[PDB]
């Protein structure tokens, strides 16, 4: 499913993402935007290392979910990567919360550093009523 901006904002808010581990809703919106464009079925295989990024948050199959074909994969979220491809993002959000519970936090995603860090990310939640 490809979420409309405000629809996603309200959904994430309801799932307890706003201010989770100090991460504001607008940063999460900036992350999903640049990682997948609010698309839940987005997948990206990295031929150089054999791991694939799944879903709206492009969560990695090496550390977070298990797809069975990634070498030395730890399944920290204890989920099948398939779960991060559903239209219902409840599992993707619970896994994303797991990821940021690590010391790096939201910095775990390079795209966040490139396009969200130190920027005016207000635009991502404007007019959504969250």
CSV table of C-alpha atoms in Angstrom, one decimal:
chain,number,residue,atom,x,y,z
A,1,UNK,CA,0.0,0.0,0.0
A,2,UNK,CA,1.2,3.5,-0.7
A,3,UNK,CA,0.1,5.8,2.2
A,4,UNK,CA,-0.9,9.4,1.7
A,5,UNK,CA,1.2,11.7,3.9
A,6,UNK,CA,-1.3,12.7,6.6
A,7,UNK,CA,-2.9,9.3,6.7
A,8,UNK,CA,0.5,7.9,7.6
A,9,UNK,CA,1.1,10.6,10.2
A,10,UNK,CA,-2.1,9.8,12.1
A,11,UNK,CA,-1.4,6.1,11.9
A,12,UNK,CA,2.1,6.4,13.3
A,13,UNK,CA,0.8,8.7,16.1
A,14,UNK,CA,-1.8,6.1,17.0
A,15,UNK,CA,0.9,3.4,17.2
A,16,UNK,CA,2.9,5.4,19.7
A,17,UNK,CA,5.7,6.7,17.4
A,18,UNK,CA,5.5,10.3,18.4
A,19,UNK,CA,8.4,11.1,20.7
A,20,UNK,CA,9.4,7.4,20.9
A,21,UNK,CA,12.9,7.3,22.3
A,22,UNK,CA,13.1,11.0,21.8
A,23,UNK,CA,12.2,10.7,18.1
A,24,UNK,CA,9.5,13.1,17.0
A,25,UNK,CA,6.8,12.1,14.6
A,26,UNK,CA,8.1,14.4,11.9
A,27,UNK,CA,11.5,12.6,11.8
A,28,UNK,CA,9.7,9.2,11.4
A,29,UNK,CA,7.7,10.7,8.5
A,30,UNK,CA,11.0,12.0,6.9
A,31,UNK,CA,12.5,8.6,7.3
A,32,UNK,CA,9.6,6.6,5.6
A,33,UNK,CA,9.4,9.3,2.9
A,34,UNK,CA,13.0,8.9,1.8
A,35,UNK,CA,13.4,5.2,2.5
A,36,UNK,CA,10.3,4.0,0.6
A,37,UNK,CA,8.1,6.9,-0.3
A,38,UNK,CA,5.4,5.6,2.1
A,39,UNK,CA,5.2,2.3,0.2
A,40,UNK,CA,4.9,-0.8,2.4
A,41,UNK,CA,5.8,-3.3,-0.4
A,42,UNK,CA,9.1,-1.6,-1.2
A,43,UNK,CA,12.1,-4.0,-1.2
A,44,UNK,CA,15.7,-3.3,-2.1
A,45,UNK,CA,18.3,-6.0,-2.5
A,46,UNK,CA,21.9,-5.1,-2.0
A,47,UNK,CA,24.0,-7.3,-4.3
A,48,UNK,CA,27.2,-6.3,-2.7
A,49,UNK,CA,26.3,-7.9,0.7
A,50,UNK,CA,23.3,-10.2,0.1
A,51,UNK,CA,20.9,-8.5,2.5
A,52,UNK,CA,17.6,-7.0,1.4
A,53,UNK,CA,15.7,-3.9,2.8
A,54,UNK,CA,12.0,-4.5,3.4
A,55,UNK,CA,9.0,-2.2,3.7
A,56,UNK,CA,8.1,1.3,4.6
A,57,UNK,CA,11.2,1.7,6.8
A,58,UNK,CA,13.4,-0.4,4.6
A,59,UNK,CA,14.4,-2.6,7.5
A,60,UNK,CA,17.5,-4.8,6.9
A,61,UNK,CA,17.4,-8.6,6.7
A,62,UNK,CA,20.9,-9.0,8.2
A,63,UNK,CA,20.0,-7.7,11.7
A,64,UNK,CA,16.3,-7.2,12.1
A,65,UNK,CA,14.2,-9.6,10.2
A,66,UNK,CA,14.7,-13.1,8.8
A,67,UNK,CA,14.3,-13.9,5.1
A,68,UNK,CA,16.4,-17.1,5.3
A,69,UNK,CA,18.8,-16.1,2.5
A,70,UNK,CA,21.0,-13.5,4.2
A,71,UNK,CA,24.3,-14.8,5.6
A,72,UNK,CA,24.9,-14.2,9.4
A,73,UNK,CA,21.5,-12.8,9.8
A,74,UNK,CA,20.3,-12.1,13.4
A,75,UNK,CA,16.6,-11.7,13.6
A,76,UNK,CA,16.5,-9.1,16.3
A,77,UNK,CA,12.9,-8.2,15.8
A,78,UNK,CA,12.1,-11.9,15.7
A,79,UNK,CA,10.0,-11.5,12.5
A,80,UNK,CA,9.8,-12.9,9.0
A,81,UNK,CA,10.7,-10.1,6.7
A,82,UNK,CA,7.4,-10.9,5.0
A,83,UNK,CA,5.6,-9.2,7.9
A,84,UNK,CA,7.3,-5.9,7.0
A,85,UNK,CA,5.6,-6.1,3.5
A,86,UNK,CA,1.9,-6.1,4.8
A,87,UNK,CA,-0.4,-3.1,4.4
A,88,UNK,CA,-0.9,-3.2,8.1
A,89,UNK,CA,2.3,-1.5,9.4
A,90,UNK,CA,1.9,-2.6,13.1
A,91,UNK,CA,4.8,-5.1,12.8
A,92,UNK,CA,7.0,-2.7,10.9
A,93,UNK,CA,6.5,-0.1,13.6
A,94,UNK,CA,7.3,-2.5,16.4
A,95,UNK,CA,10.4,-3.6,14.6
A,96,UNK,CA,11.4,0.1,13.9
A,97,UNK,CA,11.0,0.7,17.7
A,98,UNK,CA,13.4,-2.2,18.3
A,99,UNK,CA,16.0,-0.7,15.9
A,100,UNK,CA,16.1,2.7,17.6
A,101,UNK,CA,16.4,1.0,21.0
A,102,UNK,CA,20.0,0.5,20.0
A,103,UNK,CA,22.6,3.3,20.8
A,104,UNK,CA,22.6,4.9,17.3
A,105,UNK,CA,18.9,5.4,17.4
A,106,UNK,CA,17.3,6.9,14.3
A,107,UNK,CA,20.9,7.5,13.0
A,108,UNK,CA,20.9,3.7,12.1
A,109,UNK,CA,19.4,4.8,8.7
A,110,UNK,CA,21.9,6.6,6.5
A,111,UNK,CA,19.1,8.3,4.5
A,112,UNK,CA,18.0,10.0,7.8
A,113,UNK,CA,21.4,11.6,8.1
A,114,UNK,CA,21.4,12.7,4.5
A,115,UNK,CA,17.9,14.1,4.2
A,116,UNK,CA,16.4,14.7,7.7
A,117,UNK,CA,19.1,15.4,10.3
A,118,UNK,CA,19.4,19.1,11.1
A,119,UNK,CA,16.7,20.1,8.7
A,120,UNK,CA,13.3,21.7,8.9
A,121,UNK,CA,11.2,18.5,8.8
A,122,UNK,CA,7.9,20.2,9.9
A,123,UNK,CA,6.5,20.0,6.4
A,124,UNK,CA,6.0,16.2,6.9
A,125,UNK,CA,3.2,16.7,9.4
A,126,UNK,CA,1.7,20.0,8.4
A,127,UNK,CA,-2.0,20.1,8.2
A,128,UNK,CA,-2.4,16.4,9.2
A,129,UNK,CA,-3.9,17.2,12.6
A,130,UNK,CA,-1.3,15.3,14.7
